[PDB]
Write a structure and sequence with these properties.
By secondary structure, the chain is α+β, with helices and mostly antiparallel strands. Helix content is about 30%, strand content about 15%. The strands form 4 sheets. Strands 1, 2, 3, 4, 5, 6, 7, 8, 15 and 16 form a 10-stranded mixed sheet that branches.
Amino acid sequence: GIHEADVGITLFLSPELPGFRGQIKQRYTDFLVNEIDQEGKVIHLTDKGFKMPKKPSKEEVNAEKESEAARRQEFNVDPELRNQLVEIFGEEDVLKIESVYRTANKMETAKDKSVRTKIHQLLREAFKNELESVTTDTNTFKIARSNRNSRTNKQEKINQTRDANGVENWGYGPSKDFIHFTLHKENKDTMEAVNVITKLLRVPSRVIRYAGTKDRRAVTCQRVSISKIGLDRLNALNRTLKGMIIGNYNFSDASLNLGDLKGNEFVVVIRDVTTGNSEVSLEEIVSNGCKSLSENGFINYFGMQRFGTFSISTHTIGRELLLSNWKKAAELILSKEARKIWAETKDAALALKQMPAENLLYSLSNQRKEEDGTYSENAYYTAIMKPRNLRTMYVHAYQSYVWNSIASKRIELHGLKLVVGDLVIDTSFIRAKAVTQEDIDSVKYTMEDVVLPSPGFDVLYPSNEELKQLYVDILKADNMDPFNMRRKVRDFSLAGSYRTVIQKPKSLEYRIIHYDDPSQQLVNTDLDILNNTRAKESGQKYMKAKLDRYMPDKGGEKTAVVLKFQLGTSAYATMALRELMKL
């Protein structure tokens, strides 16, 4: 079991202030994550799609039936392409052709590979509408009207999807390349939820796209685009969908992409709250704690999520891969029954036969154990190089490890005071810039502007030598040089991204409410609020309680701190709650 201290997380921004013990994500409705779109609006589910009419009017049909007649007769062929078409067939057939375009009739005709399809051009293009037949009986083109009898294109019998006001897609716009929608899910991964949608629609996974992944052990809302599908079927999913509801349809030419969001709005119910500190109130603790969150912020540490299952920490493996110590890297990755065999024997083939990354062992099950029963360094390399998904993930754990470590020292040394020769970004790749003693006095940049880089080959380190000295020192300890950070493999060390040192949550609002059972919910989902509002028409409202986000304070022994806030895309919600609570 690896601790916070064992991954660079050592410090707090305001350790003077008392914290409080608590438990988060007890129920799924104790963690709301609502996406914030590119503009700054929070995404909420405000409907469960639309209701399908069973009858696909009679005055609608004869309106667009008479509307078609109008344009057919009003439309005239280009005189240049007409008197040409006369030469081919004759002034009588051109009139038979013009007549089928207007009406629902077939023209007879009466007559060479070279100009067999030169006629098929001057028909399609001149009349715009299409022709029925290629050369049929003998060498004559028996061509009636385009596909449809009653409409233009056939592609333009979309008219079967008409609204009361006569709107093309059940009140939604004209069709477009992408349908954007809102995805309300409970205890499902973003990837899981969207890939359910595609599976049910019999479509490849690549049609559906999202801006960012939301917490699973939570109820979350986000926007999702999807192509090669029509509303009618997408809308029909809500009938068969398990722990997720789809709504708020909008057609658009754009698809969604990773990064099409500003951040996320969280509502966190902290349950079973105890203060310990018996000198100051809870209301006092929280109030000052949140004031510090909003004023000062928290250290934008990488959470545990980027160091994996509390065992052989991924960063210590990452270190070995970067140092090109292949045997050591593998031995660490190998440290249920299979790992007992490997430590007891050393036979890869024996160890393989134990599971119905470790599957290293397949690679080492081939090759040859040399003498000494020692696998060759060059054999371990070959074995390491067998997925880049995990391989990179390891080296990334080392970067994040070094970062957290440094970001701690940056605060430890100076703190929230902005020192000269620090690093910021200017709104003009993402290029850094060393801060002058001047622009400190200009108070142009504040602490929340300050960034540090991930150790890498394509990344400027702090100008300030006593900060530059951390990188060399911290890495020297693990036998690496921050300036000679390029490597020979896909372990290229990355360029090394820039990352803000602190993060201040936005619209931070706390609220203390006392309860009895862990079972009962103190926060309503968007779906809860919808169904009880949508049934203000119906009349049978569960309670006024479930129109508001928060349930009212009933009273009890137990104390919950439910608090709401927005974070950047870079920030771990855990690392925000940590600063408040001191856990």
